[PDB]
Design a protein around this ligand. Structure first.
Ligand SMILES: Nc1nc2c(ncn2[C@@H]2O[C@H](COP(=O)(O)OP(=O)(O)NP(=O)(O)O)[C@@H](O)[C@H]2O)c(=O)[nH]1
Ligand SMILES: [Mg+2]
Length: 166
């Protein structure tokens, strides 16, 4: 079947793993559990097409840029995740996107800007700012909460749809 290699990237602690585990295992991981490098494979039906989501959950730690560079190279689409309560992670987004473009040798890689932890009331990144950033990237912006599952399927499925029309 069609396989979509999705890569989740972003600063440490923004909820990359929580988003992935919510998608694959339908539960919120309320646990401190830093990722080194984890792969998830799930058979899903998306818009009637049986496909295999191969999700690459990367580390936010800078000490694993080498492991990120290797598995960013093979990814077809990228979830660039920041936390709406963490302004620094929103600023780090530009660094992750530039790194994706260099390893992919491409200015138009399938990507979704993900503003995670939107359940939190102490927002520091206005939705308008992140939407403008996504607009200048030419990529969709989707706010998610791995806690409430809001937007989780939307973020991943939108990325798959970008890969189809790429
Ligand atoms: N309130 C709330 N907390 C969240 C959300 N997503 C993740 N978290 C919390 O944020 C913390 C970090 O989550 P985690 O998924 O491990 O983030 P990460 O980006 O994978 N970190 P790393 O880069 O080290 O792997 C955890 O305590 C987790 O429960 C969310 O949508 N809402
Ligand atoms: Mg993680």
């Amino acid at each position: 079947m069609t396989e979509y290699k999705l890569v989740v990237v972003g600063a440490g602690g923004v909820g990359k793993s929580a988003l992935t585990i919510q998608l694959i295992q339908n539960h919120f991981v309320d646990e401190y559990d830093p990722t080194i490098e984890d792969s998830y494979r799930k058979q899903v039906v998306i818009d009637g097409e049986t496909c295999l989501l191969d999700i690459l959950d990367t580390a936010g730690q800078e000490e694993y840029s080498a492991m990120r560079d290797q598995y960013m190279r093979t990814g077809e689409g990228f979830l660039c995740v920041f936390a709406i309560n963490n302004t620094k992670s929103f600023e780090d987004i530009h660094q992750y996107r530039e790194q994706i473009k260099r390893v992919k040798d491409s200015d138009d890689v399938p990507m979704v800007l993900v503003g995670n932890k939107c359940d939190l009331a102490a927002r520091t990144v206005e939705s308008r700012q992140a939407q403008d950033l996504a607009r200048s990237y030419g990529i969709p912006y989707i706010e998610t909460s791995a806690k409430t599952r809001q937007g989780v399927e939307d973020a991943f499925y939108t990325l798959v749809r970008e890969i189809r029309q790429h």
